[PDB]
Design a protein around this ligand. Structure first.
Ligand SMILES: OC[C@H]1O[C@H](O[C@H]2[C@H](O)[C@@H](O)[C@@H](O[C@H]3[C@H](O)[C@@H](O)[C@@H](O[C@H]4[C@H](O)[C@@H](O)[C@@H](O)O[C@@H]4CO)O[C@@H]3CO)O[C@@H]2CO)[C@H](O)[C@@H](O)[C@@H]1O
Length: 378
């Protein structure tokens, strides 16, 4: 009789502290295990059917459909505190008419900049590119003017979607997963802006999340694209940072980031589901508990009465502005192959191995082929 939780490095300390509180009040020990974020879903897909998955996992709402149709996460029954959560957060964790998690936070990326190098936020992507090149020259390559995880579709989406790409078409009958918008004229235009930044040398093909995040924390990157999950580490590193929406792609044409929702899901195969349900609906979901989570992991709260406490914080203001321009990630099982296909296309594009139009058409054909083959069933 023990509850086990898998989560990323950002939640481990606070969830272990809250787990000791739950042990004091209910008598049940809680063990929190770090698992790298990019492996949680894959490890759970192989472990849970074997009886070796955690009771509770913490992660992003795009996973919900794939996990639900494979029978691996438990629906959450209605409970009266749900009226206090934002509908956008509850819809993101809903699939097939059922709620499949308790959300704790919403998030989007934004432009994060180091005020020691950036005095005026660029208003357009053209101005950002010019400012990055000036920094690159001024400090002789010791400081990067602009860097981000370029070949990760999650981080490059604001440019693709902003110009009119889309993942699946919205219809009155739901998402049409045969109508994929990732190689339309808008997607091409957004992918060409990415290529232009490579060609002009402000990004490189080797740029990745770890080097971005490390360089910013060391004071050697002026401008990055990242989310609220990183800001505490940058405050703790003593960086004098600011946050703004991603600059418009052209005048009057905004970037359009994904919106994500982070949340708690229960393993349907757990022998401890009954206690896991109490933990989530009668302890984690409470206003006081959700505010403690915010203090340790300061993303946008999913409960309105907690957001109300922190709504004046300038980081909350800026990231709310970014998220307001965004679109929630789809959560249908068919999202699963999209990330790999688009990551491969972006790698090809930035390495000059194919034209933008060709690389995106190949990506869409590969996604269609995976959907047709039922790759999302395990
Ligand atoms: O096939 C490639 C990979 O595809 C899938 O990964 C997706 C995720 O499912 C998406 O949710 C998204 O991931 C974002 C994530 O939403 C966002 O929060 C952020 O993640 C933070 C994390 O919240 C934080 O706690 C800490 O751990 O830092 C993470 C950032 O390093 O950024 C993620 C993007 O990197 O997009 C990815 C695709 O990149 C699939 O689940 C994977 O298993 C698969 O490998």
């Amino acid at each position: 009789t023990k509850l086990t939780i898998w989560c990323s490095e950002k939640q481990v300390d606070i969830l272990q502290k809250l787990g000791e509180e739950f042990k004091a009040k209910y008598g049940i020990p809680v063990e929190v295990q770090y698992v790298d974020f990019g492996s949680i879903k894959s490890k759970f897909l192989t472990a849970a059917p074997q009886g070796q998955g955690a009771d509770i996992i913490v992660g992003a709402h795009d996973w919900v459909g794939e996990l639900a149709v494979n029978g691996l996460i438990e629906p959450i029954p209605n409970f009266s505190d749900l009226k206090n959560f934002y509908d956008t957060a509850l819809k993101a964790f809903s699939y097939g008419g059922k709620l499949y998690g308790v959300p704790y936070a919403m998030e989007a990326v934004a432009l994060i900049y180091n005020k020691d190098y950036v005095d005026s936020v660029p208003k357009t992507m053209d101005e950002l590119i010019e400012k990055a090149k000036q920094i690159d020259e001024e400090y002789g390559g010791e400081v990067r003017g602009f860097i981000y995880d370029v070949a990760n579709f999650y981080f490059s989406a604001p440019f693709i979607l902003g110009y009119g790409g889309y993942v699946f078409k919205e219809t009155p009958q739901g998402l049409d997963v045969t109508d994929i918008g990732l190689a339309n004229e808008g997607a091409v235009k957004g992918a060409k802006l990415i290529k232009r930044m490579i060609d002009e040398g402000v990004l490189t093909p080797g740029d990745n999340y770890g080097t971005m995040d490390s360089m910013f924390k060391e004071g050697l990157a002026a401008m990055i694209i990242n989310g609220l999950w990183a800001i505490k580490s940058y405050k703790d590193a003593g960086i004098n940072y600011g946050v703004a929406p991603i600059p418009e792609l052209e005048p009057g044409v905004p970037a359009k980031p994904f919106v994500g929702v982070q949340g708690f899901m229960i393993n349907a195969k757990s022998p401890n589901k009954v206690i896991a349900m109490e933990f989530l609906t009668n302890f984690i979901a409470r206003k006081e508990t959700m505010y403690k989570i915010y203090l340790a992991d300061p993303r946008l709260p999913a409960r309105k009465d907690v957001l109300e406490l922190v709504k004046d914080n300038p980081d909350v203001v800026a990231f709310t502005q970014s998220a307001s321009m965004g679109t929630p990630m789809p959560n249908v099982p068919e999202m699963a192959p999209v990330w790999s296909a688009m990551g491969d296309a972006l790698s090809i594009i930035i390495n000059g191995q194919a034209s933008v139009e060709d690389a995106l058409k190949e990506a869409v054909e590969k996604i269609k082929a995976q959907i047709e083959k039922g790759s999302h069933h395990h």
